[PDB]
């Protein structure tokens, strides 16, 4: 019933590369199907990413439009899991107005290296039974006070310090609030009121849902793991109180003197055992958009020991490298193309095309007759795969409009007449040719 922020996208059915533990691709597994050569190869680079021993590695996934290049990349992003940073960038996105192209790549690189910090501290977690705050009549003006805390098992009294007092009164904690204090830092946090004070109260000074009193021992430890990437370590260090720039995107062109200092101090946090630097992946999707200026930065950024692995996708033949007249393979300059490994995808068979449409209907919660899958496979070979994929939704919606339980071949023949393939729209554009503009 309820619908979350992430929904059925173009790749939502992909859940990994579908390799076995001997690294062979299965014919259909984890949502991926067919495409054996490129999935096998992506398995080797995925294992190289997860091994993490070597920096400055680049992979280009290449082949016809609609042949699983982005599927493999958005697929290994799932098999690598959420605990290790994978950054998806379209090659269009480095063209900033806050910063140069070589800055936007230096950020996309460094945002793809994690510094996994495990933080642990003692917390005090209890229902507040009372607060005493004492204030002198004028004098030097130093406040002093006490706090009493309770669990379902336990109780104690704390003679408070001065900095604790200003935090407790800033956060307006009151008797019957349940709170969780970081004993290492003096930060309060509030869970809500305990149920017990429905009997005696004032006219409402606060209102919320109630929460149960905390259980067990009053003092308990907490563990957090932060996957803070190098780019956000640079931003935090770029100026004092810089923290909002992590969200706001505000910092352009951070000083080299900051980065070369973070590259030293993160190495020290590795050697101290203070933080786990984890290499990630930068996926520069549609990389044929990079200017030759940006590619020449990729020649030499890609050779620091702080470089991530990077993966690229392209669907371009011999074409002019963007920003020049020079023709080259993939629209990538040979300076970079010599420096990387090329994984080449393959067009689909009937068997694979039908099997993609079959896993797609299983993600979309659609039933189709085997007759309907047959016609849709023919449509997805005569036209591109992405058109046939899209007709599944429209055919299920037309079927639901006639109150059908299963999509039939005549729902697909209907939808095929209703929404055009490019190759058919581009044909009708010949018979109305004078009416469309700027032919």
């Amino acid at each position: 019933d309820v619908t979350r922020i992430e929904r059925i996208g173009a790749h939502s059915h992909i859940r990994g590369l579908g390799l076995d533990d001997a690294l062979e691709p299965r014919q259909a597994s984890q949502g991926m199907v067919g495409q054996l050569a490129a999935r096998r190869a992506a398995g080797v680079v995925l294992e190289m990413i997860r091994e993490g021993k070597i920096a400055g590695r680049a992979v280009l996934i290449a082949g016809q439009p609609g042949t699983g290049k982005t599927a493999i990349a958005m697929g290994m992003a799932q098999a690598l899991g959420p605990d290790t940073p994978f950054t998806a960038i379209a090659g269009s996105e480095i063209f900033s107005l806050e910063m140069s192209k070589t800055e936007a790549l230096t950020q996309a690189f460094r945002r793809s290296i994690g510094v996994r910090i495990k933080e642990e501290t003692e917390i005090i977690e209890g229902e507040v039974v009372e607060i005493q705050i004492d204030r002198p009549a004028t004098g030097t003006g130093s406040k002093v006070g006490k706090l009493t805390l309770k669990t379902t098992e336990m109780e104690t009294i704390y003679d408070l310090g001065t900095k604790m007092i200003e935090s407790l009164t800033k956060d307006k904690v009151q008797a019957g609030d349940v709170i969780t204090i970081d004993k290492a830092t003096g930060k309060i946090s509030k869970l809500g009121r305990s149920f017990t004070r429905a009997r005696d109260y004032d006219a409402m000074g606060s209102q919320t849902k109630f929460v149960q009193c905390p259980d067990g021992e009053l003092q308990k430890r907490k563990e957090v793991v932060h996957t803070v990437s190098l780019h956000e370590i640079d931003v935090i260090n770029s100026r004092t109180q810089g923290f909002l720039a992590l969200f706001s995107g505000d910092t352009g062109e951070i000083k080299s003197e900051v980065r070369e200092q973070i590259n030293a101090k993160v190495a020290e946090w590795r050697e101290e055992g203070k933080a786990e630097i984890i290499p990630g992946v930068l996926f520069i999707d549609e990389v044929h958009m990079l200017d030759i200026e940006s590619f020449s930065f990729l020649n030499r950024a890609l050779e620091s020991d702080m470089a991530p692995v990077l993966i690229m996708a392209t669907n371009r033949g011999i074409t002019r490298i963007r920003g020049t007249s020079y023709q080259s393979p993939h629209g990538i300059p040979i300076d970079l193309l010599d420096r990387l490994l090329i994984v080449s995808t393959t067009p689909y068979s009937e068997k694979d095309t039908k099997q993609i449409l079959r896993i797609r209907c299983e993600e979309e919660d659609v039933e189709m007759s085997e007759d309907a899958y047959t016609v849709l496979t023919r449509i997805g070979l005569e036209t591109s795969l992405r058109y046939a994929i899209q007709l599944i939704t429209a055919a299920s919606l037309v079927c639901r409009k006639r109150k059908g339980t299963e999509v039939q071949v005549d729902d697909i023949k209907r939808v095929y007449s209703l929404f055009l393939d490019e190759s058919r729209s581009t044909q009708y554009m010949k018979e109305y040719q004078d009416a469309f503009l700027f032919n």
């Binding site: 609609g66 379209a90 269009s92 004032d202 606060s206 409009k401 929404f419 009416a435």
Partner: protein, 443 residues
């Protein structure tokens, strides 16, 4: 009353319950296969299942693809976000093209998040710090509560309050006969000003006297608040909470769009999923509509590849009036509808057709009766014949100036002789281009 626009008659797609198109309904006519296609797209959007699926309404100028894209907004109604754009909006000077697209993608997804508002308010008739019968040991006196005597046009009622409220009433300047409020969820007390009851007690005093509240001293309602995820992007990217030096400096400096990080998108998604799972926030995924899509740069089209495939994205409606144009931001590369073939592969294209002479006549009638105009049938037959020789837009546009001319000539309806005057006063693109070609050396 309201003033009539180029689309004010479009009230919906006018479909049957079976999803077929009626000849003329909801202020549209004709285009039946494209109206039926938009019927499937309304179900696509109302299902809330899909993300980033996209359609391209493709057809000659004046054939109705902006009317159909707006008819979808009427079939959906105001409950879900429909976010209109032109391709030309991406060329901001403050923020990169691709982030303007990402902001417009994030505008087309709405939370519908609901909560209680509760406030205590009124003219304060007393503030009685109320003592215990005896002090505690070693103390001179103790206040167990303040009593505040709030009044409104419904009545007076005392509120018992925590003693700490006095150490905020004297941070304000609250005195008896002010009107004040207290946020019941937060316990902060705020002063509005002296009540209007006292506006006569000096010839001048330096405050705006505030009218006495009505309804009870204690007010409650639940309210439904609808915010796009782009409102959540902005309010986190540039906080408004004033009492920090960087909040004030950030509010005295010039406002700016800024290149919001994928991390803020991630963190907002990670909290709205908390509130969707807890049932506190509904979601209404909606529509991004881009008209004049052929104005996007090839970097923008190549950004739409990632954006449309993304599992978060809205349903996108593209519209284009172009033939085999060059893709903007490439020198020589001609491509159908002015869109790269590898974007044009990702979209369900809907063919929008030229009108027959009778459909133009039927549209001109529907314009006239919603533009507020009476036209004679012989003048309408002539105006449909003008339309057939020119465009739907020119023959529709002759209506209001023909009504002004009829009204100036003392008549309540457009006659034959009025339309042929306006047709001689005002030229169309087809007749004007002939004049420029005949006068070629003079412009």
């Amino acid at each position: 009353t309201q003033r009539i626009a180029s689309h004010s008659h479009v009230k919906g797609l006018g479909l049957d319950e079976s999803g077929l198109a009626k000849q003329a309904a909801s202020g549209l006519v004709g285009q039946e296969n494209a109206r039926e296609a938009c019927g499937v797209i309304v179900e696509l959007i109302k299902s809330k299942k899909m993300a980033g699926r996209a359609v391209l309404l493709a057809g000659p100028p004046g054939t109705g693809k902006t009317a159909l894209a707006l008819a979808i907004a009427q079939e959906l109604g105001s409950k879900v976000p429909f976010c209109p754009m032109v391709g030309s909006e991406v060329y901001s000077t403050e923020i990169k093209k691709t982030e303007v697209l990402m902001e417009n993608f994030r505008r087309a997804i709405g939370l519908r998040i609901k909560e209680t508002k509760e406030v205590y308010e009124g003219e304060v008739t007393e503030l009685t710090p109320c003592e215990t019968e005896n002090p505690m040991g070693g103390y001179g006196k103790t206040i167990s509560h303040v009593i505040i005597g709030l009044k409104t046009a419904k009545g007076t009622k005392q509120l018992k309050l925590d003693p700490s409220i006095f150490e905020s009433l004297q941070k304000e300047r609250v005195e008896a006969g002010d009107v004040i409020y207290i946020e019941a969820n937060s316990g902060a007390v705020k002063r509005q000003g002296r009540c209007d009851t006292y506006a006569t007690e000096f010839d001048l005093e330096a405050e705006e006297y505030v009218p006495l509240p009505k309804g009870d001293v204690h007010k409650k309602k639940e309210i439904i608040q609808d915010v796009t995820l782009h409102d959540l992007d902005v309010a986190n990217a540039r906080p408004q909470g004033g009492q920090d030096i960087l909040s004030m400096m950030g509010q005295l400096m010039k406002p700016k769009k800024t290149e919001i990080t994928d991390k803020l998108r991630g963190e907002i998604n990670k909290v709205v999923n908390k509130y969707i799972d807890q049932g506190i926030a509904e979601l209404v995924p909606g529509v991004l509509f881009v008209d004049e899509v052929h104005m996007l740069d090839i970097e923008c089209f190549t950004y739409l590849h990632r954006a449309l495939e993304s599992s978060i994205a809205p349903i996108v409606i593209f519209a284009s009036n172009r033939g085999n144009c060059v893709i903007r931001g490439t020198e020589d590369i001609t491509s159908p509808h002015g869109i790269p073939l590898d974007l044009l592969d990702r979209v369900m294209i809907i063919r929008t057709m030229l009108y027959t002479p009778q459909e133009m006549k039927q549209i001109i009638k529907i314009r006239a009766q919603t533009e507020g105009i009476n036209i004679s049938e012989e003048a309408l037959n002539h105006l449909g014949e003008i339309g057939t020789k020119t465009t739907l837009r020119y023959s529709v546009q002759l209506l209001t100036p023909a009504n002004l001319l009829a009204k100036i000539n003392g008549k309540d309806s457009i006659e034959k002789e009025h339309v042929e005057e306006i047709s001689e006063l005002f030229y169309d693109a087809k007749s004007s281009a002939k004049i420029l070609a005949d006068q070629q050396d003079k412009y």
